Amino acid sequence: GSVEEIRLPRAGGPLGLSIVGGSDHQEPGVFISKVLPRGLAARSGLRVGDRILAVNGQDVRDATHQEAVSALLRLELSLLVRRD
């Protein structure tokens, strides 16, 4: 498919996205399962089904669910994602 960087401002609200998957949870990776319709992730271009590859430059391709959660919560948030 295609890889995009998506940068979100860290303005203190929710990101407005949900993830599933992880190396402990067949199709491998951490995926965006929900993007709240008017939230920051949606406005920023994130889409359901996107695979999170990297969080602020940190590789999460083979991360467990909880490892990816920790990276997301850790001034801007850079998400490298793959789609299609």
């Binding site: 929710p14 990101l15 949900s18 993830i19 599933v20 949870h25 929900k34 669910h65 959660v69 997301l72």
Partner: peptide, 6 residues
């Protein structure tokens, strides 16, 4: 399995 909203 889980889904985590942030």
């Amino acid at each position: 399995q889980s889904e985590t909203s942030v």
